[PDB]
Amino acid sequence: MRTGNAN
Amino acid sequence: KESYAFAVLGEPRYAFNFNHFDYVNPAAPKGGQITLSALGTFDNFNRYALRGNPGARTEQLYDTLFTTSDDEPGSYYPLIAESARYADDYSWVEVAINPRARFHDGSPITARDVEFTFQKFMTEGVPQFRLVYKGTTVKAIAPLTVRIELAKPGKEDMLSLFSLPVFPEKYWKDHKLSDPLATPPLASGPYRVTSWKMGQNIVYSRVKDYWAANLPVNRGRWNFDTIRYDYYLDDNVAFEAFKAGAFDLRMENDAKNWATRYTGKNFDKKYIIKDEQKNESAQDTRWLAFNIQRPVFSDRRVREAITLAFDFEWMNKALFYNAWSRTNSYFQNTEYAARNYPDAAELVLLAPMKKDLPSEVFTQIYQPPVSKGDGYDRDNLLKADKLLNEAGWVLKGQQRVNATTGQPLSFELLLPASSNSQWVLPFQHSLQRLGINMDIRKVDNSQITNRMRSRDYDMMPRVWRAMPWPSSDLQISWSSEYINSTYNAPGVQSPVIDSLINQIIAAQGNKEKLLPLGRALDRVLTWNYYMLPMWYMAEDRLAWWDKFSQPAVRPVYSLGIDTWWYDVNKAAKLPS
Lengths: 7, 576
Known about the structure:
CATH superfamily of the largest domain in chain B: Dipeptide-binding Protein, Domain 3
Radius of gyration of chain B: 25 Å
Distance between the termini of chain A: 10 Å
Strand content of chain A: under 5%
Number of helices of chain A: 0
Number of domains of chain B: 3
Helix content of chain B: 25-40%
Largest interface: A-B, 7 and 24 residues
Oligomer: heterodimer
Distance between the termini of chain B: 57 Å
């Protein structure tokens, strides 16, 4: 995911 | 040259006469509440920040230019955008913005807001974004026309920008994108945050004058007046709260719950409905990540050995009612899974890198270890021993120690306190019988998130989300330059992976070239034992209190809860 960090 | 709908591969299903999706009831009535659970905690409202634990649903605060259907892998339909003009290679697109498009304060969504949004992600967003879109520009060329130019072809990279939230400049000019938000941002989607209690609940209210309520993509959806999330510190307390009616809907991930604990008065009297459906598309898979940047897991042989110590057939039979299937692919249950021997196109891709590949990539189909399920598999444990010894980890007394240094072979398994974790002690016991010490550490949701992001672990559980085709997103998770994206769970920086993914990212939109490339990549990732495969099931197990109705058709790629509605007659039959 290019717009946010993992979960 | 001009369209209303886009598809990463093939053509969009709803290209013609698009009034509503097949999996909605366009007449669904508005009203009522759905109450949901979330596990762990949250501490802010900015999903896009560099840090923090964002609230449930805070990734859907904003409408986007186009929106994906749920019955297709990658098809985009008008939301804020009405249409687009484009190059045949998708290297540029001019997007027409709906002049009715509004933020929640009633102000217009313009081409400028889109240009502002792109620059905001480029300068204050997660570091991977500016890497992916490094040659790219996004410009308001007219009040309601935004032109996107890529430096290199990337049909998927273009379409992915259609899923970017469109931020209101008037609000976001005063907040860094990288910082957490203590209060909800000015937004635009069909639900807005109306109250919350930090770490405990979030309430979303349906925006009753939502400008796009009647677009085709929105018809029959967003029916509930209220969506409430309550947070639970662990899944056992949440499951008992579900059974008592404290929230309405449960996705059941524990095999023992499902097999044995769907009982009691509430089930007898049919207040709670329970449903189980085969799911035939791409599957989320569980794995344990080996941090390969730590010396303990630097050697492929030790990773292989530790994998042999995980007795899945025993766990499935003794603990999990035979419910699970063994994970065996990074493209699980798709055409991209390397389930057969490499074909000729795969060998053209693979043979040049033979020197940097396990030889089994060419000779064998990857199969995680199988035991008889009796406990104490002697073949698998003897092989683990043989591999450990070759890697220099030898028994001294009951403990494995490095043959050179006498250091014990020891590692920490980092776990969220919120998960069930019934497999952990048996795995620990198996490892202890090899002379390996595995310390268990359970931590809260905020510690787990932070440490998962920085890869401050030896081993931890990770979910590999379903990937229906080999997406250019793969680079973020696996390519060396994206190592600090927070998605590269093992810490791998491999020129073999890099090269295959560079090929994939040059073949975006081309199924013919992506098929052998996906299989090839699958062989490389699996045969290196970067992670320890766990399990999945191709079956959704859901339960809910009987207050809802549903469209005849369920979408392929989601449960479609956003298409459900509150049914006043069914709800009237339930007690308080």
